Amino acid sequence: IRSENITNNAKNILVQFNTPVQINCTRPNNNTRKSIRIGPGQAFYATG
Amino acid sequence: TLQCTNVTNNITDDMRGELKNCSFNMTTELRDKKQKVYSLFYRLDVVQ
Amino acid sequence: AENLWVTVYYGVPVWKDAETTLFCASDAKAYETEKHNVWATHACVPTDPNPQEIHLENVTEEFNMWKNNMVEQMHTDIISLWDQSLKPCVKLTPLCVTLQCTNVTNNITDDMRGELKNCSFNMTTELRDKKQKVYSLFYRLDVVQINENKEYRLINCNTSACTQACPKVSFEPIPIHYCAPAGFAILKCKDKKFNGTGPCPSVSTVQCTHGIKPVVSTQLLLNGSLAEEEVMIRSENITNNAKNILVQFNTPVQINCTRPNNNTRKSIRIGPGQAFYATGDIIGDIRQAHCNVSKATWNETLGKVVKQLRKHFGNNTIIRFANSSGGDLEVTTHSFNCGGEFFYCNTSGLFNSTWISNNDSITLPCRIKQIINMWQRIGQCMYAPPIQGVIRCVSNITGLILTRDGGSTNSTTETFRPGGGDMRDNWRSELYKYKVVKIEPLGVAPTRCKRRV
Amino acid sequence: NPQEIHLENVTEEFNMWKNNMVEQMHTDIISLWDQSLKPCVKLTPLCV
Amino acid sequence: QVQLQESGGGLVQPGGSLRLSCVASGFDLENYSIGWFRQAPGKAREGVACLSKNSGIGHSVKGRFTISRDGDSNTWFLQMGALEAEDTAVYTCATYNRACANYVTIWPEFRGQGTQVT
Amino acid sequence: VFLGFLGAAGSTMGAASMTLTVQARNLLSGLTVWGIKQLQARVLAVERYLRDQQLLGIWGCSGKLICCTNVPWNSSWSNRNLSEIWDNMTWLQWDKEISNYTQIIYGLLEESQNQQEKNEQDLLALD
Amino acid sequence: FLGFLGAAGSTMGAASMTLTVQARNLLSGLTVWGIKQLQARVLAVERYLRDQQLLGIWGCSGKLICCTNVPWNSSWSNRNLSEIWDNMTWLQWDKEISNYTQIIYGLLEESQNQQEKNEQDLLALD
Amino acid sequence: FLGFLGAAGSTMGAASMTLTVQARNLLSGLTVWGIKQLQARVLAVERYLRDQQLLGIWGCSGKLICCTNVPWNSSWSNRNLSEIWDNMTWLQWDKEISNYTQIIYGLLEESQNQQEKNEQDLLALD
Ligand SMILES: *[C@@H]1O[C@H](CO)[C@@H](O[C@@H]2O[C@H](CO)[C@@H](O[C@@H]3O[C@H](CO)[C@@H](O)[C@H](O)[C@@H]3O)[C@H](O)[C@H]2NC(C)=O)[C@H](O)[C@H]1NC(C)=O
Ligand SMILES: *[C@@H]1O[C@H](CO)[C@@H](O[C@@H]2O[C@H](CO)[C@@H](O[C@@H]3O[C@H](CO)[C@@H](O)[C@H](O)[C@@H]3O)[C@H](O)[C@H]2NC(C)=O)[C@H](O)[C@H]1NC(C)=O
Ligand SMILES: *[C@@H]1O[C@H](CO)[C@@H](O[C@@H]2O[C@H](CO)[C@@H](O)[C@H](O)[C@H]2NC(C)=O)[C@H](O)[C@H]1NC(C)=O
Ligand SMILES: *[C@@H]1O[C@H](CO)[C@@H](O[C@@H]2O[C@H](CO)[C@@H](O)[C@H](O)[C@H]2NC(C)=O)[C@H](O)[C@H]1NC(C)=O
Ligand SMILES: *[C@@H]1O[C@H](CO)[C@@H](O[C@@H]2O[C@H](CO)[C@@H](O)[C@H](O)[C@H]2NC(C)=O)[C@H](O)[C@H]1NC(C)=O
Ligand SMILES: *[C@@H]1O[C@H](CO)[C@@H](O[C@@H]2O[C@H](CO)[C@@H](O)[C@H](O)[C@H]2NC(C)=O)[C@H](O)[C@H]1NC(C)=O
Ligand SMILES: *[C@@H]1O[C@H](CO)[C@@H](O[C@@H]2O[C@H](CO)[C@@H](O)[C@H](O)[C@H]2NC(C)=O)[C@H](O)[C@H]1NC(C)=O
Ligand SMILES: *[C@@H]1O[C@H](CO)[C@@H](O)[C@H](O)[C@H]1NC(C)=O
Ligand SMILES: *[C@@H]1O[C@H](CO)[C@@H](O)[C@H](O)[C@H]1NC(C)=O
Ligand SMILES: *[C@@H]1O[C@H](CO)[C@@H](O)[C@H](O)[C@H]1NC(C)=O
Ligand SMILES: *[C@@H]1O[C@H](CO)[C@@H](O)[C@H](O)[C@H]1NC(C)=O
Ligand SMILES: *[C@@H]1O[C@H](CO)[C@@H](O)[C@H](O)[C@H]1NC(C)=O
Ligand SMILES: *[C@@H]1O[C@H](CO)[C@@H](O)[C@H](O)[C@H]1NC(C)=O
Ligand SMILES: *[C@@H]1O[C@H](CO)[C@@H](O)[C@H](O)[C@H]1NC(C)=O
Ligand SMILES: *[C@@H]1O[C@H](CO)[C@@H](O)[C@H](O)[C@H]1NC(C)=O
Ligand SMILES: *[C@@H]1O[C@H](CO)[C@@H](O)[C@H](O)[C@H]1NC(C)=O
Ligand SMILES: *[C@@H]1O[C@H](CO)[C@@H](O)[C@H](O)[C@H]1NC(C)=O
Ligand SMILES: *[C@@H]1O[C@H](CO)[C@@H](O)[C@H](O)[C@H]1NC(C)=O
Ligand SMILES: *[C@@H]1O[C@H](CO)[C@@H](O)[C@H](O)[C@H]1NC(C)=O
Ligand SMILES: *[C@@H]1O[C@H](CO)[C@@H](O)[C@H](O)[C@H]1NC(C)=O
Ligand SMILES: *[C@@H]1O[C@H](CO)[C@@H](O)[C@H](O)[C@H]1NC(C)=O
Ligand SMILES: *[C@@H]1O[C@H](CO)[C@@H](O)[C@H](O)[C@H]1NC(C)=O
Ligand SMILES: *[C@@H]1O[C@H](CO)[C@@H](O)[C@H](O)[C@H]1NC(C)=O
Ligand SMILES: *[C@@H]1O[C@H](CO)[C@@H](O)[C@H](O)[C@H]1NC(C)=O
């Protein structure tokens, strides 16, 4: 437990762990990206 | 401006709204012509 | 006497192969009545008034030209200079409008049928809202037909945006000398039998390299440096098809190249401050640009090249030439940089001959192109502004980048076809006899010294 | 508190019309203004 | 690794289309370009397509044949249509010079094995 | 005479070790391209010269050209006669001959100089 | 051996044994890490050059141990000799004298100037 | 007197008093004023290092006040020593050798080379 002033209400308390916590997460969706033309040369990819 | 409408294909109750099925005009490679392109925009990136 | 003890010597003549970065050395010419340059020499340090070359003896230094880093450094430097010079002036994106172009028949000649096109289009004036109907002349190579009076469009206008070549600057090649910094030495080979990979027992140190012109050409090197004695053949394998053969001539071949049409440049406003220079209203007759070589000189030069080339392929082998068989418009054709106008010539009147064991002129047609893609990295096109008047160019064309054909097992049907590709052989023919050595002055040696306390 | 060593017995030939500071500063101020005018508005659309 | 692996060969009825493809790796496919062969019995070697780097242009010897690429995927697609009786041969995909130097005539290095199109 | 940078780079070490000043004097010669590009080379040259000079100064050395030293030759790095070494071999051949055993030599020179300084301190303090 | 800065906590006498190794790596060595890395290199060069000039015009240039004049004024440290060298560390010594080590850098200069005076006069006399 | 470059008006003999003073301030220490400053720093370091190398080429190694061979040729100056050391200022003196320095800077070099060769021969023959 680390803090600049542990007796203060506006200082973050940077807790550092001893064992990691495994976290997964996904975006369970295909995202088909289609390219369209901004103008001459420039292109812009938007999810289709 | 985005003539956007709200997406209702194979959607889930938790993800209501959110994705929006936006259609807007866009300059083509020639800087004299307007296309009509479409994209998907999350509700966090579009305001009314 | 036994006390053979180690002593240390500083500033000893010992070198080790290494790599570093060099800089400019250009002739000053007082650099006062100058209109700038694309390789800006105002920031380049001035060359020595009398560079000194020190001949070394007893020395056999290994040389190699195909894994030399000087060529890569040169290429990066010139590309960076080209990119830097194109920033601080017009950036014409508003030219992809739908051009309406017809033919031109103001007493045209049949060989140049089509080619030049009368294009007209809407264009924004100085004001952001008002529009004007302007016209220009666009070559057939720079316009494509959309919506297949037809509607044409600039060829670069779906894939890149062109910054018009800066009207004040010039592309005229000037010599530049690459001088190594302190602590590094430039070794130059003076052997006339030098061919590339192999030691050269005549190496001499120089302050830095001689004047070299960063010319841009394909399949026919122009204003190169000739090798004396005889025409020399260099490669990285003479027995591999996919490797070029940087043939270097010993007798320069004169080549003239013209453009017998006037070009009334007419600047037109396309926005606030920005002005775009265009062609229009060719005065007099219109005829396609051409190039002249001398058949008497070229036939003899090809004979000499064949005689020197049969050494590596046997004295009973046929040797045929042919033109390029396909590729881009910058490899199957000559790729001049003549006075700000980028020619593209028909080098098929030269490479058409067959050689066996045992006054006039050749005219190559040329196709002027304005919209170019030199330094072929995609998305860096540039529009070369038209140049008024009739132009002429003279060169010695001392070089050749032929590629072998091969592949038909073992037989005598060898054919050579010109072909460029990577833009590095126009300098690999100029920095072949050069290397950079890092001097290591520290060195220990045993003597009878005792180091008095 | 910058130091100012007064020197005696010394004569020096000055020159105000061939000074280099008066030119280096002239270029430097232009460089300053060109640098300070870059990172904000570059209004083109006032030509209507 | 540099060797090329081809796929899509087979039998085609006159008047159809194919999707010849070939893929490769070898930490050196940024300096080379990829084109295709054509070798019919009794005749020499020709070329059919060459996707030139440094220009992105899809040069081909005939109008029907077209070369194409997709993203950073190291696969090249030769699309051929309106096939006719002569187009029965051994199609090989090989590597040509960085700017598609002389082809339809050259014999390159780092070549493939070649499928069969009848 | 036979002046010029690396003028005697092929001559034997006997005559080469007369004009080391020529090889050592020009070690300090002198946003756009040719701008910071030249300055980087200048800084690198200064770095290399400073490395060499400090390496000379760390040992008991830096008179200038020649500097006799302690820690006898191990006689294993080169089993060659003195006359042959000093009049029959050019400097680059010597470099490639003894380029494998340099770091140990430098460490030995450093330790010898430090021991010499300690001996000097001991012989100066007591009196 | 004890590496660079290895003898930092060792006693003063033993710390004055590996000066060379810690005096050997004082010169090790556009976009980010461009002009700024070169700035770091130039700063290191300037610092080393200033230190060498100080080890110079003082009268030394042999580096490492260097005998010199200007006898030790008692006001700077009224302590024994051995206690400085057996049970003290260089960091503690630097804390002990931090404001005193600015007049010393002038006493050494004046001693060097007077020594050069004496040497020059005695050499030119004969 | 005192201060950096504070004795340029004093006599030649008296001005050889603050050599350390003038030697100390030879090493004082993207965007505008951000590349000019670094260029100036590099130039100053290079100038000082070249000057130090030139000094060390001849055998001085101690900078301030050096003794050397190559006796004073009467062509360079024809006048009494006390007149040189008692009335001139250094700037006035530099006028007399504005063009004679190039030969001296090589004469001292060859004298140093001769002395080094004699030292090496004497140590080798023993
Ligand atoms: C290979 O080298 C030759 C020789 O320098 C190059 O020819 C040179 O081309 C330039 C461009 O036109 C000529 O400069 C022009 O000269 C005319 C007439 O004096 C002048 O009115 C123009 O303002 C411009 O200065 C130059 O004279 C000409 N060299 C000679 C000797 O006539 C050639 O361009 C080089 N090859 C390539 C591919 O660049
Ligand atoms: C580069 O140069 C070669 C040099 O031959 C050009 O090849 C020639 O191109 C013409 C284009 O019309 C070919 O057609 C011929 O036209 C004449 C006109 O009457 C006709 O009589 C012939 O029967 C023939 O159809 C010609 O066959 C071809 N070869 C020769 C030897 O003339 C080439 O077009 C130039 N350009 C390029 C991009 O290669
Ligand atoms: C794209 O441009 C077309 C150009 O006509 C727009 O179509 C007009 O839209 C307005 C409302 O915004 C209508 O009042 C007009 O009647 C429409 N004209 C025609 C010919 O359809 C269109 O709205 C623009 N935006 C989009 C998303 O299509
Ligand atoms: C330049 O702008 C004018 C705008 O008036 C274009 O005029 C049009 O021309 C076509 C045929 O040429 C007519 O069918 C249209 O009715 C015209 N527009 C009008 C009258 O508003 C002209 O074509 C433009 N020039 C080009 C595209 O080259
Ligand atoms: C030069 O080319 C030769 C052949 O053109 C190269 O040697 C070939 O290496 C490949 C590598 O797989 C072998 O399959 C061939 O059989 C080899 N050729 C022969 C004739 O044996 C060679 O590597 C190239 N480079 C050099 C320096 O020679
Ligand atoms: C190219 O097109 C321009 C534009 O139409 C032509 O210029 C016209 O010429 C006719 C007479 O031939 C005049 O009546 C028009 O007023 C001109 N228009 C403009 C805008 O100047 C030109 O003649 C065509 N040909 C060439 C070679 O430029
Ligand atoms: C090389 O030369 C050959 C003929 O010598 C050219 O082949 C001709 O090309 C034109 C246009 O491409 C065709 O119209 C002819 O039918 C072709 N004739 C033959 C016999 O092939 C070839 O185009 C030339 N290539 C280059 C790059 O110049
Ligand atoms: C860290 O430990 C010291 C030990 O005395 C203590 O004084 C200090 O407050 C601590 N800091 C924290 C807990 O953030
Ligand atoms: C830490 O917090 C206490 C809480 O009142 C406060 O009195 C003290 O001044 C703070 N000290 C610092 C260094 O922030
Ligand atoms: C997403 O689509 C691809 C083909 O477009 C398919 O291979 C993949 O299985 C799809 N994603 C999931 C989670 O099934
Ligand atoms: C789409 O559905 C959400 C769900 O409540 C609704 O709030 C939103 O207004 C809808 N979008 C439109 C354009 O009506
Ligand atoms: C006009 O130019 C086109 C080029 O696209 C050409 O096909 C056509 O023959 C030309 N017309 C005339 C009359 O020359
Ligand atoms: C667009 O540019 C490409 C080059 O990538 C070219 O192949 C094509 O013909 C151009 N025009 C189109 C796609 O309409
Ligand atoms: C260059 O000449 C040397 C001479 O022995 C030869 O070994 C080498 O193969 C040659 N390189 C070529 C011809 O590319
Ligand atoms: C180009 O125009 C000038 C000016 O009228 C004229 O003197 C010259 O003859 C023209 N060019 C040609 C090739 O006639
Ligand atoms: C090139 O040769 C042709 C052949 O007739 C000639 O008409 C033309 O004037 C020549 N061009 C020159 C010499 O510049
Ligand atoms: C090229 O032009 C020059 C100058 O007009 C002439 O001296 C030379 O003969 C020409 N070369 C050829 C091959 O016609
Ligand atoms: C000139 O070129 C032809 C082309 O084949 C060749 O046969 C001939 O030997 C060459 N030399 C002469 C003098 O004609
Ligand atoms: C090419 O050479 C052949 C025979 O060598 C000849 O018949 C033909 O006319 C030549 N063509 C050209 C364009 O030189
Ligand atoms: C071209 O060749 C001639 C022939 O002597 C030579 O004088 C000239 O320097 C060469 N180069 C150029 C650019 O003219
Ligand atoms: C080259 O080596 C020979 C071998 O004896 C020698 O005589 C000659 O002087 C050397 N050349 C020099 C040192 O320039
Ligand atoms: C030192 O160089 C290489 C490095 O491994 C070694 O193989 C060689 O034997 C050594 N040199 C000698 C002369 O043994
Ligand atoms: C640290 O101090 C202890 C005595 O307090 C001593 O034994 C030890 O040697 C010291 N550490 C080192 C590295 O000398
Ligand atoms: C200037 O010269 C006078 C004698 O003429 C001398 O007394 C004085 O000290 C000199 N000035 C300085 C600053 O030394």
From TrEMBL, chain F:
Domain Retroviral envelope protein GP41-like residue range list: 13-127
Compartments, record wording: Virion membrane; Host cell membrane; Host endosome membrane
Region ranges (Immunosuppression): 37-55
Highest taxon listed in the record's lineage: Viruses
Membrane topology: Single-pass type I membrane protein
Coiled-coil region(s): 96-127
Glycosylation site list: N74, N81, N88, N100
Disulfide bonds: C61-C67
Residue numbers spanned by region Fusion peptide: 1-15
Membrane-spanning residues: 1-18
Name assigned to this protein: Transmembrane protein gp41
